Amino acid sequence: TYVQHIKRRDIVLKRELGEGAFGKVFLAECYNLSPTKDKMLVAVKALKDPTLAARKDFQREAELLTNLQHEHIVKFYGVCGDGDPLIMVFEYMKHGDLNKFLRAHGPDAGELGLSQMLHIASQIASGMVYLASQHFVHRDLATRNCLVGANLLVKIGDFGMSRDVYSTDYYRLHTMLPIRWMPPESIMYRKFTTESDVWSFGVILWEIFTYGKQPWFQLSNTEVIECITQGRVLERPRVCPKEVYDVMLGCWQREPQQRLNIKEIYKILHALGKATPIYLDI
């Protein structure tokens, strides 16, 4: 597909946010982008001196995000031309990643109410309904890969593992894998499907209702693999309503075809809310 072309001259970097496998991410301003062409905040990913593999991954990401557009998928504005660094431009989400957001509202840090937790969950589920409709399998759904904007707006992205910060969330089972978020068939057989994404969503629900705590925090990586392989599941958080835990269990059926599908999950989460927010388009 064609990707929108942003001029390098129109981007002004303001602050560095982090670095992944695919280069540094910055808060920036961009001109000539908004309908008024007035400057607007964006996030910029910059890849310096990219290898061939990095260039290919950059192109794959740009094409994917041009094609996958939805209210709850991270919004992508375009790329700069060929050169160094390679630059990709995203919508700025001012509250950052959902895992840090959840932790900032947790007891170990006011707090988030049931309505707010369900709204976060429902928005992620909505994004996943869209991904499933495009036959896109994400493989790394987790709150660390979701962004939070104004009005508790949550969108799904994929940032990968941190380049500069120590992380406990990935383990080399080749490739680093988010094993704590994965079902038995993904760990044992590398089978990744919409159904393994549903498993991960159940783990996201657990993250939300524990304010971002790491799944299986009490277990080493080796113990996690054995635990998941042997069919143990995450325990119900004390502040988690039984109905919400029952949705998690619906995600965590050992047989993938017995799991709730994400459309079913979306409907349930929406019925579970006492006063589900109303979505408008004007």
Ligand SMILES: Cc1c(C#Cc2cnc3cnc(-c4ccc(N)cc4)cn23)cccc1C(=O)Nc1cc(C(C)C)cc(N2CCN(C)CC2)c1
């Ligand atoms: C949004 C984003 C960005 C960004 C951003 C942005 C805008 N505002 C903020 C605010 N905070 C952050 C922030 C700060 C700290 C930390 N730890 C995480 C995020 C990022 N922001 C950077 C790199 C990659 C992406 C991104 O999600 N790329 C993406 C998305 C998708 C969708 C279809 C799920 C797919 C892909 N793929 C590429 C790689 N993947 C393995 C397979 C597919 C890449």
